[PDB]
Write a protein that binds this ligand. Structure first.
Ligand SMILES: Cc1cc2nc3c(=O)[nH]c(=O)nc-3n(C[C@H](O)[C@H](O)[C@H](O)COP(=O)(O)OP(=O)(O)OC[C@H]3O[C@@H](n4cnc5c(N)ncnc54)[C@H](O)[C@@H]3O)c2cc1C
Ligand SMILES: Cc1cc2nc3c(=O)[nH]c(=O)nc-3n(C[C@H](O)[C@H](O)[C@H](O)COP(=O)(O)OP(=O)(O)OC[C@H]3O[C@@H](n4cnc5c(N)ncnc54)[C@H](O)[C@@H]3O)c2cc1C
Ligand SMILES: CC1=Nc2ccc(Cl)cc2[C@H](c2ccccc2)N1CCN1CCN(C(=O)c2ccco2)CC1
Ligand SMILES: CC1=Nc2ccc(Cl)cc2[C@H](c2ccccc2)N1CCN1CCN(C(=O)c2ccco2)CC1
Ligand SMILES: [Cl-]
Ligand SMILES: [Cl-]
Ligand SMILES: [Cl-]
Ligand SMILES: [Cl-]
Ligand SMILES: [Cl-]
Ligand SMILES: [Cl-]
Ligand code: NA
Ligand code: NA
Ligand code: NA
Ligand code: NA
Lengths: 489, 487
């Protein structure tokens, strides 16, 4: 019919945070929920869709594609264990990878769609949502607030959960460049590619492209500062740089693209600020992600933005307008799917259950699917050392024995535990090597239970594994004392 | 002749830890006896123990090696193309690379002895001459020539364990794990006998390296392999072994073995069935190695099954005589023997009594795919707690829908005391499981409840996060009885 529909909760953006909120409110609490997204399945023109950034063009397809990339290491490393086969026959078929990923993703899209069609009180609306007033969300045909109205949805409570978007720098020839969004759909793997950025996406893609490159290919990563993966453990930052270099990736630090132009053959010609040049078939920018707040017409209700650009929120995800909340990357804090999900669950417990609950943003475990991957939870030592008078660092680094037979001698596993040495409390744990993302998960539970180094040391090791290293350290390699590093007290 | 604070019989997992800790932490004078300096025939274990020479260390390399049979197949799902007809598994290369790694550790360990004050290695066979004297002889025979008499304040028994070989006719045409480590050729047809981890691990090893037309059979006298591990996991690992071409013969037991004219083995089971294979590997058990020690010289008591009786501080019935590791016939794991060794040394030579905790010890089976476990299985929990909840997740991860190994179900189970949420055990089957489970070991040392798991933020995408996404039991045990709803 031609009438608006009414809800307890309207959620704009059917992604990690919004889906957790909406499912919880409808199924745990009997609320009537509407959820809006721009697309029912992944890909061009809008990339993200039902299921969010993670399902469509994020965690899920990238993990698949890293898993694909790892077979290059596997097929080579097999020879050290006796495997023999015609090495000259090996090809990496990118198009098969992409078609397999696309169908996996589309199956989640269809699955999610089916759940909306079926679940009472939980409704999907296709289009672009924005705030018309504090109790009405309008759903339009495009992100232009002048496009046609498909629905008006009344809402007692409104959740903003539109996520983030790739930031593109304002350089000449930026139009010749792509983001991670387009990278997922490249018709063919680039012979030569530049990945611009030192963060997890650049690095992860650098390893994907490096395994699927055609014959005379070359992957280059550039970063404007001097060491990639700011925010992660420094030892690990240096080591993953070496290991990426060891597998044929050229890391360019202290380099930033100044312009891009097309060569007469149509390749991209990149000029760096230093006047170095590089010719490539693809330039993928991954220099950052920014909150998606522009299309919500927040000025219509006066929802405040932080100096930085995220929707401002309190610890309860509340904006300055009482019944309007924000969760996920739109708050511009930790841009991780399970953080968005925890925030959603906790919002809905607080507002609709009788159960106030704030997300804990500390001691969050995360991973980088570099090759080999990082697993990390809690504080890096230089941050810990500014908060706590005495810090101890327990460190074990070693090429594991499998990799002395596989040939990949450069694959050094690193395990570090950072403590408040005043009481043993584990402040952070940082891992580099095969299995690190899997090892770190239950370490997150330890940290939430305020584990001490002796709790780890007293646990009996599972042997032989990499993880047992965390249960074998009782003497600090070094310390920080009122901020200064020294091998002894 | 010669005087020591500590004489350790067996340079193995427990014995080395104890010997190291006594010499370097307490500045004691230590002698350590073992029968061989380097791995391999004739005594198999050597300096380093069973783990280093014919156990954890080389078995893991070999299972790593076997995993490629899967990785090579599964690469195709992700686009990888190559001539599969060209693929062959070179067992001899694997064996050589393994031998080299093990040999390096043997040498390294020798270097360590050579450079460590108060830590001496003696080659030979040790036994108890009297309450304070360890005789070191030429051979296992207690009548063979004396090489040494070591006087000792304190004597450590740490000679480990040995494969149990049943007394069936033709048992001498069978091998054990010791021999499996050195086979010249990968066996084309093989029978592994036994339901425990060593049988299962070797079954997956031989399965990957068998020549064309090959075939691994695993047999087990009872109805389901891997007793002691979680039941769902036992059933699922059986399915996953069968999917990868291993034939699992349950309720079958060899009654005899004969030699065929081609040098193969003819097996007859108790049921009358028969099977011809090239190698029959008996892995039905491992028994405490107490026989050459001459414990009767001083009257150290054995328990009924044959381990050296110990108290919780590793003390035998005779003052200043201790036993740790497999010889005590408890948990036969390397980190458990190390921990015993350490705790014993701190008690005897240090200011503080310390006893090893044998509960909530994390462990793995390097089956393909592998198991990780820590703490109680639900049937054991249900005889000791009135109200037990089980939380279970089981699904083929997406990566294995693409790889084409659709049979590879990941299983995560968490078993709780439902009266207060205390996690009593966690049980995993799937790639990464032994890695996942280590930090769960630490969790169980922190009174972790199911809600502590559940309120922790996942790392995505991993198999592990599955342990932080369960808050609703799948079923219960109330007063020992399995049901799906609580009263
Ligand atoms: C390449 C890449 C790899 C990643 N890998 C990981 C990883 O491995 N692990 C991890 O934890 N995190 C990963 N992330 C980050 C993760 O994807 C995000 O943190 C998470 O998806 C954010 O959840 P959200 O609810 O804020 O938004 P999203 O999941 O991004 O959902 C926002 C939704 O809003 C829709 N939308 C936008 N504007 C409107 C509008 N006006 N109207 C209606 N709908 C709208 C979008 O179409 C989208 O579906 C990755 C991200 C990227 C880009
Ligand atoms: C095939 C196999 C795989 C295994 N895999 C694992 C695994 O993955 N993880 C794990 O945790 N555990 C594993 N184990 C178990 C592990 O090897 C044992 O629990 C561990 O080695 C026990 O150490 P120990 O100190 O009791 O004795 P051991 O390490 O066996 O050492 C005892 C030593 O005493 C010597 N010795 C014996 N008699 C005499 C004598 N009278 N005089 C002088 N020396 C003597 C022996 O040569 C031997 O080196 C495995 C065992 C086997 C057989
Ligand atoms: C809880 C939940 N959180 C999400 C968080 C982020 C994303 Cl991207 C997706 C979900 C997912 C979801 C999918 C579709 C609509 C809402 C929520 N989702 C629902 C998943 N759901 C699990 C339980 N389920 C049941 O039917 C059920 C409920 C109770 C016992 O079984 C079907 C699928
Ligand atoms: C402690 C220890 N326990 C063992 C338990 C079981 C085995 Cl099978 C081997 C060891 C090993 C050892 C090897 C040789 C003789 C005695 C002990 N050993 C010493 C090996 N050690 C590794 C680390 N190391 C250190 O000095 C050290 C300790 C803490 C930080 O660095 C040098 C040698
Ligand atoms: Cl291709
Ligand atoms: Cl940059
Ligand atoms: Cl820097
Ligand atoms: Cl061979
Ligand atoms: Cl049996
Ligand atoms: Cl049984
Ligand atoms: Na509905
Ligand atoms: Na330990
Ligand atoms: Na010495
Ligand atoms: Na959780």
């Amino acid at each position: 019919s031609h009438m608006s529909k009414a809800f307890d909760l309207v959620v704009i953006g059917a992604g990690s945070g919004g889906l957790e909120a909406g499912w919880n409110a409808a199924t745990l609490y009997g609320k009537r929920v509407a959820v809006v997204d721009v697309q029912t399945s992944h890909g061009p023109p809008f990339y993200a869709a039902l299921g969010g950034t993670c399902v469509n063009v994020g965690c899920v397809p990238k993990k698949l594609m890293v898993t694909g990339a790892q077979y290059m290491d596997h097929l080579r490393e097999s020879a050290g264990f006796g495997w023999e086969f015609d090495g000259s026959s090996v090809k990496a078929n990118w198009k098969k990878l992409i078609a397999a990923k696309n169908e996996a993703v589309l199956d989640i899209n269809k699955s999610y769609e089916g759940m909306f069609n079926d679940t009472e009180g939980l409704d999907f609306f296709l289009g672009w949502g924005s705030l018309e007033s504090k109790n009405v969300v309008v759903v339009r045909e495009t992100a232009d607030p002048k496009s046609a109205v498909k629905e008006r949805l009344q809402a007692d409570h409104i959740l903003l959960a539109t996520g983030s978007w790739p930031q593109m720098p304002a350089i000449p020839g930026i139009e010749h460049c792509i983001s991670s969004n387009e990278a997922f759909y490249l018709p063919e793997p680039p012979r030569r590619v530049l990945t611009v950025g030192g963060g997890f996406i650049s690095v992860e893609f650098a390893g994907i492209f490096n395994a699927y490159k055609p014959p005379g290919g070359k992957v280059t990563l550039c970063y404007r500062n001097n060491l990639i993966l700011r925010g992660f453990d420094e030892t690990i930052r240096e080591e993953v740089t070496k290991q990426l270099t060891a597998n044929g990736i050229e890391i360019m630090t202290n380099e930033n693209p100044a312009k891009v132009s097309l060569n007469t053959d149509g390749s991209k010609h990149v000029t760096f600020e230093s006047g170095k040049t590089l010719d490539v078939d693809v330039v993928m920018m991954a220099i950052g992600r920014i909150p998606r707040t522009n299309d919500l017409q927040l000025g219509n209700v006066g929802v405040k933005l932080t100096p930085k650009g995220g929707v401002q929120v309190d610890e309860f995800s509340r904006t300055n307008v009482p019944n309007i909340y924000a969760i996920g990357d739109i708050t511009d804090r930790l841009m991780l799917t399970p953080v968005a999900i925890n925030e959603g669950a906790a919002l809905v417990d607080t507002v609709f259950g009788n159960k106030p609950r704030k997300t804990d943003h500390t001691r969050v475990a995360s991973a980088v699917f570099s090759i080999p991957p990082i697993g990390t939870c809690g504080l890096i030592e230089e941050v810990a050392a500014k908060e706590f008078e005495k810090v101890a660092v327990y460190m074990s680094s070693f090429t594991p024995l499998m990799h002395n037979i596989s040939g990949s001698k450069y694959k050094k596993f690193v395990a570090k535990i950072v403590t408040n040495h005043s009481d043993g409390t584990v402040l952070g744990v940082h891992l580099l090597g095969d299995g690190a993302p899997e090892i770190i998960q239950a370490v997150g539970v330890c940290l939430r239970l305020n584990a001490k180094i002796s709790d780890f040391y007293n646990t009996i090791g599972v042997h032989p594994t990499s993880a047992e290293e965390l249960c074998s350290m009782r003497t600090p390699s070094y310390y920080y004392v009122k901020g200064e590093k020294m091998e002894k007290l």
